[PDB]
Design a protein around this ligand. Structure first.
Ligand code: GTP
Ligand code: MG
Lengths: 87, 78, 368, 49, 103, 14, 360, 87, 46, 63, 23
């Protein structure tokens, strides 16, 4: 874990083109966005980083846009029920 | 008590390795609920997230990340 | 300025030096000797260049970590994108192109979608040399060239291993099963992980054949990776005597021709009594018959043995499981075990009839 | 047996004569050969004397 | 031996005598270990060649004294310690399969 | 003996 | 599939970094617009040396010889020998082996056989006294270039036994945020198949240039007598400047040829060394490539090394462009916070390198 | 789809090496082979490895006669003669 | 020819291995039994 | 250059037509051939059992 | 002339270094 950049995927979509699916007809190897938090070592930001999605095969990354934290921890003390969040 | 102090101070020593986990914004710790089919799990994940976030999370699916501390948040999956 | 000039890669390097103010040649560029002579007649330009253990290791690594932080405290798109990039806890979207149809079609959110970043080594294939072990609670022994599903790093993949032994560190020669209660070596064609990484191995991953027993079969670590292995199986050549004298004998059928015996001249043989010997010359008229000399007089009830070694190959077979591309996501079926194939197509297990042990009773040994 | 398993110091069983080569009875093994050889050697020793 | 303690924790460098052609020879069941307290490198035994494949490298070993009760035959006198644990698990229990070594 | 455990080779098509 | 380069520049560095990174490359247009276009014999024999060192790497030269395909493999080492051609000395082939040398299954014990020296290449004393200490403090501890016999050009006939025997995991992270104080300045003046007075003439010329700096000058002297002298007359001189508190060194060498005055060559190499001291900061202009290569294949940490203004050049930044072209890493040049000189401190975050060939 | 192409080829080679696995062994992959458990003179093509008892008798070539003759010449020009000496 | 070559390379391998094993045995003997006897010598003072 | 090692005072020199090869005669009863590019000796052939007074090349050859 | 430069060649030191009562 601490020499490997991994990530559990809590959100998944295909950002393919539905009229391209209407053209070719559902056989298409289609592109996919995978959203989640990442653990371990820092995963590099250049495209082309090889990645094993554990159960579907080996791929390489195409583009990474990091997003603001959907479930952040807020800045003796106690934890406010306002700040007990859930994602 | 000196022999006790030596033999207890010895078992603090471990293999010095790197950490590679940040201290500013660490990721949510992955909590995996593992059981044979027919015990706990769902009921347990529901009960823990209801106690933690005051929100009845009926019909779970996928990983569920909640904040459970001032700096410790954690991800529930089954 | 200079870093942007260096990594702005549509301008020539001399243009970078020009708007700031080739390696086959090892020694660098110097001036003319006359210019350098008038330059370094003086000397004063460079006269000022001239003139507990555990906590210690932890202090060294925390010193490196504070060096990491105080040298990361730099330009924002330099740190947060390109010089390290996305440390941990960053929430990202990550786009993969050419993902199979079956993932998006059969995406069931119960099954987790894990992704891990491969190192430079783990994209290479070839022979991985492990030392493994039948897991102590797995009942049946394991067999070479029977598939088992390994969990080696991020990948799970069914492979055909072949279990070896370095018999007192001389060969690396080939067993036919794993040992009962200890480690052997093994070699499988798969993706080359780094050495010293551990792995599990499983006979059966589906649920229709999940039975009542323990399902994890093998444990081990990876010893070495390579592109080739050189492992051997022993073949003995057996032949029988047909004309015995003192200290020499004529040996009948381990060869088919005098060319074959000529190929094998001088080799050391032995009987099953451990009487050592050497083959000397092929006889002329009976073809594979030869003349050997022994330590002393062998008998007519003996078998001579030429212990040779035949090379054996690992089978370059590799299918990853791809369980998430199924409509059921359990019930993954790969290559079957050899007993399962025999039970399927009803072939009886191969039985050499004179390989089976008996109850030998000695007659009393009396001499004249 | 200090650090040896009883499943490790098992009993390796010995093999019989091949059934094709069966008229020359009893494939003899190393204990039979040493019973042969030391008999021959003591008789040659007394013959030499 | 270790100073004031009875045992000492250590770091496995490399299995010495890994090319010895004799099974269960004292050269073969013989591990080099860096003690973590004072940093020095010592040499320790292991119970047999069979339990030699439970240590690999930087394994957080625990080692006690040896205690020879008589001048042995295939000995190498001049190795003082024996490995008694590996990664916090007793390797006699590992050798008789009572526990599994965690990583 | 040089060939025995090699796996590569330059492919000189010149 | 293949990272594509153009032209026959930096050829050894491209094949070396492809072997380190494990990435298949193509080098296209090897001098295609030329009268005898394609690969030359010395770089073809360098490809043969790469096939000797590695195992399972497939190199694929084209019909015309102007493009090469290198699909790398596992570094295995072993003992070998290399009969390199007369076009380049043994330094041209032992220089790119010092990168691949500590990252193999079996230790490097190679002996190269050919010409020892050249004007435009590395010598035995260059490789040893300059390039071994930077590896010696980047992490290796047992490395040795032995001369069994040496051969001056054109006939040569000298053999050089490169033996490295510390197989490290990865080089350590460098931290040289200083300019190292030069403690001494030593050297070696060699001559084969000529009179033994030329060595003392070279030494006297170098030390009469060096005499006005207030340090200590010491040049050792070797004439080579017998079969160890090789098949041709030759002589040359190599000076190093030695920082002894850290171990750093700055070198300069050359060789004489037909019609060369030894006092002239000695004072030329002395002034060339003093100019390397001027244009140097914690490395040399020729020790800088493998220094930043070991910094870029270190651990996954930040390693920082001081360099000066004049060490930046088209060679240095084409090195940096090739590094980023293969394994996608940048150097960060931050300037020092004091202004009597122009020195950057290059911080490189190393990739997560280990050697995965050494058996555990 | 592409996964269907890969699955067809994977199960093709799976069928191939499963009937290979249940097939009979080669002659070389069994111990205890006689002359008639294997094809005729198959050991000329095969290059087996075996240990041999003694070193063969040395072939006397021109190099060993040259070395022996200049040994004799050194002894005979230094008069290093191992003769008997008359009592 | 293969006879002579294989015999002499096996002899070379065995003579190298015996030297290597004897070297590591008596280096473990000398430079660690000195420390064993030093500990015994400074334990006899107690 | 300094060519050395003749071991008695040294008489007539000659330089070849290509200006590559010199001869060196002396009262040591032998003439030495030197290569002038590096000052390296080639032969030291012993002639002339009294003293070689003079030595001269041919016009166009190395004889 | 430099005959001492051959007299101070790798003989012993550079040869070893150029490889790195009564009654
Ligand atoms: N008596 C009793 N029933 C329990 C307990 N915990 C869970 N159950 C029952 O378990 C039943 C099966 O549903 P779950 O417990 O959600 O099942 P699960 O553990 O998620 O396992 P899966 O069915 O495989 O998803 C529920 O309807 C609960 O009534 C417990 O502590 N006691
Ligand atoms: Mg459930």
């Amino acid at each position: 874990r601490n020499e490997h950049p991994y990530m559990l995927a809590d959100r998944f979509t295909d950002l393919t083109h539905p009229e391209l699916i209407e053209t070719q007809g559902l056989q298409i190897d289609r592109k996919v966005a995978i959203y989640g938090y990442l653990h371990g070592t820092p995963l590099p930001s250049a495209p082309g980083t090889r990645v094993h999605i554990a159960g579907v095969g080996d791929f390489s990354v195409a583009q990474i846009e990091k997003l603001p934290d959907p479930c952040p921890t807020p800045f003796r003390k106690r934890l406010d029920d306002k700040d007990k969040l859930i994602y | 008590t000196m022999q006790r102090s030596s033999d207890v101070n010895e078992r603090k020593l471990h293999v010095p390795m790197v950490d590679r986990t940040p201290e500013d914004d660490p990721p949510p710790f992955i909590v995996a609920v593992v059981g044979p089919p027919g015990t706990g799990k769902t009921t347990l994940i529901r009960s823990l997230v209801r106690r933690m976030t005051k929100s009845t999370l009926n019909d779970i699916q996928g990983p569920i990340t909640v904040v459970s501390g001032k700096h410790r948040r954690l991800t529930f999956l089954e | 300025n200079i870093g942007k000039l260096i990594y702005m890669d549509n301008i020539s390097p001399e243009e970078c030096i020009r708007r700031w103010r080739d390696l086959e040649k090892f020694v660098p560029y110097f001036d003319t000797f006359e210019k350098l002579a008038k330059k370094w007649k003086s000397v004063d330009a460079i006269k000022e260049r001239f003139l507990t253990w555990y906590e210690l290791q932890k202090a060294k690594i925390s010193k490196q970590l504070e060096i990491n932080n105080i040298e990361y405290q730099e330009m924002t798109p330099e740190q947060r994108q390109r010089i390290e990039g996305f440390k941990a806890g960053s929430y990202v979207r990550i786009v993969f192109e050419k993902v199979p149809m079956e993932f998006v079609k059969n995406f069931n959110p119960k099954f987790p979608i894990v992704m891990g970043g491969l190192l430079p080594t783990e994209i290479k294939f070839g022979i991985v040399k492990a030392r493994l072990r039948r897991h102590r609670w797995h009942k049946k022994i394991l067999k070479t060239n029977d598939p088992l599903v390994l969990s080696l790093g991020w990948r799970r993949f069914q492979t055909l291993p072949i279990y070896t032994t370095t018999d007192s560190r001389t060969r690396t020669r080939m067993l036919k099963y794993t040992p009962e209660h200890t480690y052997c070596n093994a070699a499988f064609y798969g993706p080359l992980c780094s050495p010293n990484t551990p792995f599990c191995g499983v006979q059966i991953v589906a649920n229709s054949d999940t039975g009542n027993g323990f399902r994890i079969a093998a444990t081990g670590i990876v010893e070495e990776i390579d592109v080739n292995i050189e492992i051997v199986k022993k073949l003995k050549l057996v032949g029988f005597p047909y004309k015995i004298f003192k200290n020499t004998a004529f040996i009948k059928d381990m060869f088919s021709s005098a060319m074959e015996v000529a190929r094998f001249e001088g080799a050391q043989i032995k009987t099953v009594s451990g009487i050592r010997g050497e083959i000397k010359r092929a006889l002329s008229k009976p073809e594979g018959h030869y003349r050997a000399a022994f330590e002393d007089k062998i008998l007519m009830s003996d078998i001579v043995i030429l212990r040779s070694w035949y090379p054996v190959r690992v089978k370059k077979f590799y299918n990853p499981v791809t369980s998430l591309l199924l409509k059921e996501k359990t019930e993954w079926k790969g290559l079957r075990l050899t007993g399962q194939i025999r039970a399927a197509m009803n072939l009886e297990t191969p039985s050499n009839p004179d390989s089976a042990y008996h109850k030998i009773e000695r007659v009393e040994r009396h001499f004249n | 047996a200090k650090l040896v398993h009883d499943v490790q110091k098992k009993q390796h069983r010995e093999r019989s004569q091949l059934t094709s080569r069966s008229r020359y009875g009893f494939l003899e093994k190393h204990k039979d050969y040493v019973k042969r050889a030391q008999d021959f050697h003591r008789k040659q020793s007394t013959l030499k004397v | 031996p270790f100073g004031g303690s009875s045992h000492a924790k250590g770091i496995v460098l490399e299995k010495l005598g890994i090319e010895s052609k004799q099974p269960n020879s004292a050269i073969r069941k013989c591990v080099r270990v860096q003690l973590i307290k004072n940093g020095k490198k010592v040499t320790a035994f292991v119970p047999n060649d069979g339990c030699l494949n439970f240590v690999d490298e930087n394994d957080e070993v625990l080692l006690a004294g040896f205690g020879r009760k008589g001048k042995a035959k295939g000995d190498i006198p001049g190795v003082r310690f024996k490995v008694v644990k590996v990664s916090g698990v007793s390797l006699l229990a590992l050798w008789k399969e009572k526990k599994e070594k965690p990583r | 003996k040089m060939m025995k455990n090699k796996r590569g080779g330059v492919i000189d098509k010149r | 599939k293949y990272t594509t380069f153009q032209g026959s520049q930096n050829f050894r560095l491209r094949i070396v970094l492809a072997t380190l990174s494990g990435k298949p490359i193509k080098i296209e247009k090897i001098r295609s617009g030329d009268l005898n276009p394609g690969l030359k014999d010395y770089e073809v024999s360098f490809l043969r040396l790469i096939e000797s060192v590695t195992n399972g790497s497939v190199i694929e030269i084209s019909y015309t010889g102007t493009t090469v395909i290198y699909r790398p493999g596992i570094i295995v080492g072993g003992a070998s020998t290399h009969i390199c051609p007369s076009s380049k000395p043994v330094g041209y082939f032992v220089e790119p082996m010092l990168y691949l040398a500590p990252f193999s299954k079996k230790k490097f014990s190679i002996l190269f056989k050919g010409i020892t020296a050249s004007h435009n290449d590395a010598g035995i004393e260059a490789i040893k006294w300059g390039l071994m200490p930077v590896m010696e403090k980047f992490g290796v501890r047992e490395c040795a270039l032995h001369t069994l016999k040496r051969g001056s050009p054109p006939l040569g006939g000298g053999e050089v036994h490169l033996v490295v025997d510390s197989l490290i995991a990865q080089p350590i992270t460098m931290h040289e945020i200083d300019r190292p104080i030069i403690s001494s300045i030593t050297g070696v003046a060699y001559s084969t198949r000529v009179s033994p007075s030329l060595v003392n003439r070279m030494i006297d010329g170098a030390k009469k240039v060096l005499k006005n700096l207030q340090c200590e000058v010491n040049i050792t002297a070797d004439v080579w007598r017998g079969e160890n002298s090789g098949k041709s007359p030759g002589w040359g001189i190599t000076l190093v400047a030695q920082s002894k508190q850290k171990g750093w060194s700055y070198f300069a060498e050359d060789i004489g040829d037909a019609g060369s005055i030894p006092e002239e060559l000695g004072e030329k190499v002395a002034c060339q060394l003093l100019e390397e001291i001027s244009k140097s900061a914690a490395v040399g202009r020729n020790q800088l490539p493998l220094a930043i290569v070991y910094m870029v294949i270190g651990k996954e940490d930040i390693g920082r090394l001081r360099i000066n203004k004049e060490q930046i050049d088209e060679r240095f930044i084409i090195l940096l462009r090739d590094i980023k072209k293969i394994f996608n890493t940048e150097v960060f040049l931050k300037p020092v916070d004091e202004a009597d000189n122009e020195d950057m401190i290059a911080t490189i975050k190393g990739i997560g390198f280990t050697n995965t060939s050494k058996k555990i | 789809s592409s996964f269907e192409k890969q699955q067809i080829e994977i199960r093709k080679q799976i069928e191939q090496l499963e009937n290979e696995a249940v097939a009979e062994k080669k002659w070389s992959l069994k111990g205890e082979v006689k002359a008639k458990d294997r094809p005729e003179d198959a050991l000329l093509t095969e290059e087996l490895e075996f240990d041999r008892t003694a070193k063969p008798v040395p072939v006397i070539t021109s190099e060993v006669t040259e070395s022996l003759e200049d040994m004799i010449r050194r002894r005979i020009q230094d008069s290093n003669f191992d003769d008997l000496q008359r009592r | 020819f293969e006879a002579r070559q294989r015999i002499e390379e096996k002899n070379k391998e065995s003579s190298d291995y015996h030297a290597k094993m004897a070297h590591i045995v008596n280096t473990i003997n000398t430079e660690e039994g000195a420390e064993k006897n030093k500990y015994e010598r400074e334990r006899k003072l107690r | 250059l300094s060519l050395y090692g003749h071991k008695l005072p040294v008489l007539s020199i000659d330089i070849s037509f290509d200006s590559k090869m010199i001869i060196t005669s002396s009262a040591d009863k032998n003439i030495k051939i030197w290569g002038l590019d590096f000052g390296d000796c080639h032969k030291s052939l012993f002639a002339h059992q009294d003293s070689i007074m003079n030595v001269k090349f041919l016009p166009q050859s190395h004889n | 002339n430099g005959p001492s430069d051959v007299y101070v060649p790798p003989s012993k030191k550079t040869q070893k270094l150029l490889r790195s009562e009564n009654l």
